[PDB]
Structure 1
Amino acid sequence: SGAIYVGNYRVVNRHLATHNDWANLVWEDSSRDLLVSSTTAQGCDTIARCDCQTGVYYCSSRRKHYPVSFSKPSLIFVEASEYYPARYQSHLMLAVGHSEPGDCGGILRCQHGVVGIVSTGGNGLVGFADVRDLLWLDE
């Protein structure tokens, strides 16, 4: 679990969005596993606007942060799950690092701010959904 709180927006994994997220929907994209909902309170986070390929992510299944080197956002095949059919997930960055399904929502940050959230992984890999291209998150 986990979310990004920026301005009057909450960014979560689309497969973990709640009834309240869907009732206050701003934008969603099944291909990216992202959903953004509106909030009444101002949020705690800043979004990175950069091309960093190194950063640090939070891993809930270890209660620890890990440094990673990650690939540039791209289209990557993701096997079928209870939430989606087998498909290509876009804007996804891969890294070598521990992750389990419940780690989705953990934030990846670089020196410029939030880069994305955990969305895929397994077998010593972790995949992050990028948010750096969503310029409207800041206005």
Structure 2
Amino acid sequence: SGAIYVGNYRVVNRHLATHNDWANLVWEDSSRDLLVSSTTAQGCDTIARCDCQTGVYYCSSRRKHYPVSFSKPSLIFVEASEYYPARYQSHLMLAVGHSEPGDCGGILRCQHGVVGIVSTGGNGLVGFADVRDLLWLDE
């Protein structure tokens, strides 16, 4: 589990969105496994606006942060789950690292700020959903 809070927005994995998230829907995209909802209270996370390929991610199944090298955001084939059929998920970044299903939502961050959140995993490869191109999260 886990989310990003910047201004009046909450960024979660789409497959983990709540009834309150859908009742206050700003934007959602199944191909990216992303959902943004609106908040009464103000968030104070900083979103990275960069092309970094190294960073640290939080892994709840180990209660640890790990340094990783990741690929640039791209279209990557993801296996079928109870939330989606087998498909290409867009804006996905891969890293060699540990993850489990309950690890989705954990933040990946570089020296510039939040880059994205854990979204996929398997075969000792962890996939992150990029949020750096969503320029409207600040404005």
- TM-score relative to the length of structure 2: 0.99
> Corresponding residue for 1:49?
49
Partner of 1:22: 22
The structural deviation recorded for 1:44 is 2.4
State the Cα distance separating 1:122 from its structure 2 match: 1.4
Whole-angstrom CA distance in 2 between matches of 1:86 and 1:19? 25
Instruction: Give, in whole Å, the separation in 1 of the partners of 2:90 and 2:23.
Output: 25
Q: How much has 1:123 moved relative to structure 2? A: 1.9
Shift of 1:70: 0.1
Give aligned-pair identity as a percent.
100
Residues 16-70 of structure 1: per-residue CA shift (max 9 Å, x gap): 0000000000000000000000000010211000000000000000000000000
Give the whole-Å Cα distance in 2 for the aligned partners of 1:60 and 1:116. 15
Task: Return the alpha-carbon distance in structure 1 between the equivalents of residues 133 and 42 of structure 2.
Answer: 21
Distance 1:129 1:3 in 2: 12
Deviation at 1:124, TM superposition (A): 1.1
Deviation at 1:111, TM superposition (A): 0.2
- Segments of structure 1 that go 5 or more residues without pairing to the other structure are none
Higher strand fraction: Structure 1 or Structure 2? 2
Report how far residue 80 of structure 1 moved.
Answer: 0.6
User: Can you give the 5+ residue segments of structure 2 that lack an aligned partner in the other structure?
Assistant: none
In structure 1, how many angstroms separate the alpha carbons of the residues matched to 2:56 and 2:124?
A: 16
Deviation of 1:107 after TM superposition, in Å, equals 0.1
Partners of 1:58 and 1:128 in 2: CA distance: 11
Q: Could you tell me how far apart the structure 2 residues matched to 1:69 and 1:138 are?
A: 26
CA distance in 2, matches of 1:32, 1:68: 21
Describe the SS at the equivalent of 2:31: helix
C-alpha displacement at 1:6, in angstroms?
A: 0.4
Shift of 1:106: 0.3
Structure 1 runs of 4+ with >6 Å offset: none
Establish whether residue 93 from structure 1 lines up as the match of residue 79 from structure 2. Answer: no
How many residue pairs get aligned? The number is 139
SS, match of residue 41 in structure 2: coil
CA RMSD of aligned residues (A): 0.4
Q: TM-score, normalised by structure 1?
A: 0.99
Q: How many Å separate the matches in 2 of 1:62 and 1:75?
A: 28
Equivalent-residue separation in structure 2 for 1:101 and 1:29 (angstroms): 20
Structure 1 window deviating more from structure 2 (122-131 vs 48-57): it is 122-131
